[PDB]
């Protein structure tokens with residue numbers, strides 16, 4: 001009989017005492033210590049006085065779990081601890097003043113997303129996600145990477161798409177004040193104006209150029225003809241312009257950061273391009289430098305505050 005603590009958020013700690021013969025699974029349910037499954041393991045001396053993550057089994061823990069993670073999915077904690085057991089072993093070097101990830105288990109898309117998040121203004125709604133966001137920007141990104149995999153329903157080693165990962169994260173972020181007003185002009189139908197909010201207001205799939213998005217882009221109308229969609233008003237701290245991988249010239253000072261993707265569909269490699277005093281390329285732990293750049297780009301991130309068109 002030795003005393004321990006059980007928690008679901010590492011904030012509210014509940015005091016318990018455990019028997020040595022019975023395993024943790026017989027007494028608490030699925031139990032984790034430092035991200036390691038100890039459901040079948042039995043108590044030792046070092047376990048006394050230490051805190052254990054446990055699956056919610058009563059209503060008090062069920063409520064605390066939602067208030068930290070904003071999910072009731074019973075599998076979330078297990079998927080989170082499974083990813084964390086890998087991400088704790090990864091290395092997170094500082095590259096060009098930013099926290100990156102040494103390559104491991106196909107994490108190239110995580111590194112590009114992690115580098116992008118440190119360069120755009122974002123506030124997460126789940127307290128677990130925002131707290132780990134802060135710890136990650138300071139250099140301790142293991143818990144943050146595990147949460148990203150858990151919220152995106154992705155496992156370690158699985159092949160990830162950066163645009164898809166950013167979209168999942170934006171749905172758990174406060175983008176309520178973000179607003180986008182578009183205008184589509186068809187020769188026959190006429191002029192239609194639409195207003196988008198939230199995640200739909202910051203993401204566009206179709207073109208990398210924020211300038212071309214303002215000047216107008218060609219989309220098919222309901223009548224079948226090719227109408228023209230252009231941006232009327234944009235109120236958001238950033239925008240994300242995505243397009244299928246293609247050769248693109250990035251000029252210093254015209255953008256914030258970008259995602260480079262080489263190789264075949266789903267089984268390629270991501271790289272991160274950021275515009276500082278010059279153009280920097282971050283590939284995990286490796287860093288290169290160039291005055292101008294041209295390569296296969298699929299995401300470009302631009303700064304914004306409030307924009308209104310002249311048309």
Ligand SMILES: CCn1ccc(-c2cc(-c3cnn(C)c3)cc([C@@H](C)NC(=O)c3cc(OCCN(C)C)ccc3C)c2)n1
Pocket residue numbers: 159160161162164244245261263264265266267268298
């Ligand atoms: C509308 C047309 N479009 C939209 C996206 C793309 C696209 C095309 C190509 C493309 C084509 N040829 N080559 C040679 C490469 C490549 C990509 C890039 C950005 N990502 C992945 O490769 C990828 C997709 C994944 O999951 C995807 C599964 N998802 C629907 C649940 C998972 C992991 C990765 C790496 C994206 N084209």
Ligand SMILES: [Cl-]
Pocket residue numbers: 070071
């Ligand atoms: Cl929610």
Ligand SMILES: [Cl-]
Pocket residue numbers: 070125126171172173
């Ligand atoms: Cl949320």
Ligand SMILES: [Zn+2]
Pocket residue numbers: 012013014060
């Ligand atoms: Zn409590």
Ligand SMILES: [Zn+2]
Pocket residue numbers: 070125126
């Ligand atoms: Zn929420």
Ligand SMILES: [Zn+2]
Pocket residue numbers: 086105156
């Ligand atoms: Zn691993």
Ligand SMILES: [Zn+2]
Pocket residue numbers: 085086087089105
């Ligand atoms: Zn591992």
Ligand SMILES: [Zn+2]
Pocket residue numbers: 106107108109268269270
């Ligand atoms: Zn990779």
Ligand SMILES: [Zn+2]
Pocket residue numbers: 186187188189190221222223224225227
């Ligand atoms: Zn029309």
